[PDB]
Design a protein around this ligand. Structure first.
Ligand SMILES: CC(=O)Nc1c(Cl)cc(CNC(=N)NC(=O)Cn2ccc3ccc(C#N)cc32)cc1Cl
Length: 373
């Protein structure tokens, strides 16, 4: 394939984010940057911190330009503050171009950096609307498209336990099997989609699709869990408990407050159900379903023991399809045609009885009502 040099450009530790090497400034400073499809700022640590091995040094970059403007980015648990500026940016194992991009130099932070994660910055891949301080601040990818020939499209293959590929400018066919199925992007801020139905072990959850998309549903690579709206989570957990009732688990396991460990080799994946999301398709009344295995939603925590954490958690900000979902699939963010594609990942962790799947088409009536306004 012609994108061979971008294959395998992602690394990471489990549950700690996938990162790509970027070089910034001149002479080259190379940094490990978190790949996040749920945000829109390019930001790098620019001061020493206990969790950072290296960081961006602006005074050593002759091409660094100061924007004389501070930036503050709050998240749910953490936050960071820093200074805005521009510099030359490249991705060594990505497309062969260099761009002048906005960089947020992070000079202070709370619970943002992860001990041992080996990354020191974040690459926001979503649209300008959700950028701090405001929309006038062109996100990295927008800058890439404007200044260069690179087609307005990228794709992600995150392989679970860690590594994967971020293909920029195209689609690499060795990364997936079967056909690609596309769902429209509802609005360009987050990568927003519409879930029209949810099944556990082929059994329908029987809720109004409005509930599945309450607030919004997004595809977000810098989040670990599949997060479901309060009511949907409650129902889903009932159904999963019922589907795996040949075994018993403490109530805190389903809330992620407890772990269960099996002896090495013996996890009974067979007792947990497959989970299915149906997404609106590209044609009236047409949908398709993506289906994930326990190997995706039970995550290992790093002896003689294998400990697992349930990785479906409740949300107050709608559905977030994080790495739990994405590690099953090759995902194509086709920004040029306002659509997102899913195909079975050539490298998804599976066993011999069941595999992740993307199947279609299905007929779902009145899908237009499922979105929130
Ligand atoms: C240690 C850690 O969690 N670091 C971290 C942090 Cl603080 C923020 C990010 C930002 N990227 C995200 N894709 N997502 C979030 O931060 C989660 N989050 C971001 C905004 C936000 C708002 C409401 C809720 C709820 N409920 C959750 C929210 C990435 C990482 Cl790795």
């Amino acid at each position: 394939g012609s994108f061979v040099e971008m294959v395998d450009n992602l690394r990471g530790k489990s549950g700690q984010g996938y990162y790509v090497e970027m070089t910034v400034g001149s002479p080259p400073q190379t940094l490990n940057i978190l790949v996040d499809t749920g945000s829109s700022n390019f930001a790098v640590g620019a001061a020493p911190h206990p969790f950072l091995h290296r960081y961006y040094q602006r005074q050593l970059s002759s091409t660094y330009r100061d924007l004389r403007k501070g930036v503050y980015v709050p998240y749910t648990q953490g936050a960071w503050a820093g200074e805005l500026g521009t510099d030359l940016v490249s991705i060594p194992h990505g497309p062969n171009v260099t761009v002048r991009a906005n960089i947020a130099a992070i000079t202070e932070s709370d619970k943002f950096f992860i001990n041992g994660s080996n990354w020191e910055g974040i690459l926001g891949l979503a649209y300008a609307e959700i950028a701090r301080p405001d929309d006038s601040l062109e996100p990295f990818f927008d800058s890439l498209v404007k200044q260069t020939h690179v087609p307005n499209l990228f794709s992600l293959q995150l392989c679970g336990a860690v590594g994967g590929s971020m293909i920029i400018g195209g689609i690499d066919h060795s990364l997936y099997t079967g056909s690609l199925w596309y769902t429209p992007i509802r609005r360009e801020w987050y990568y927003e989609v519409i879930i029209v139905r949810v099944e556990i072990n082929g059994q329908d959850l029987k809720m109004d699709c409005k509930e599945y998309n309450y607030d919004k549903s997004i595809v977000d690579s810098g989040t670990t869990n599949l997060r479901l709206p309060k009511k949907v989570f409650e129902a889903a957990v009932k159904s999963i408990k019922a589907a795996s009732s040949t075994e018993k688990f403490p109530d805190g396991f389903w809330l992620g407050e407890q772990l269960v460990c099996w002896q090495a080799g013996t996890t009974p994946w067979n007792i947990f159900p497959v989970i299915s999301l149906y997404l609106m398709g590209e044609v009236t009344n047409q949908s398709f379903r993506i289906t994930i295995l326990p190997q995706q939603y039970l995550r290992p925590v790093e002896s003689q023991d294998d400990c697992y954490k349930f990785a479906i958690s409740q949300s107050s900000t709608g559905t977030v399809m994080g790495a739990v979902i994405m590690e099953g699939f090759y995902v194509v963010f086709d920004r040029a045609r306002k659509r997102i594609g899913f195909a079975v990942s050539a490298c998804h962790v599976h066993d011999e009885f069941r595999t992740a799947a993307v199947e279609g088409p299905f007929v779902t009536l009145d899908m237009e009502d499922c979105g929130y306004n």
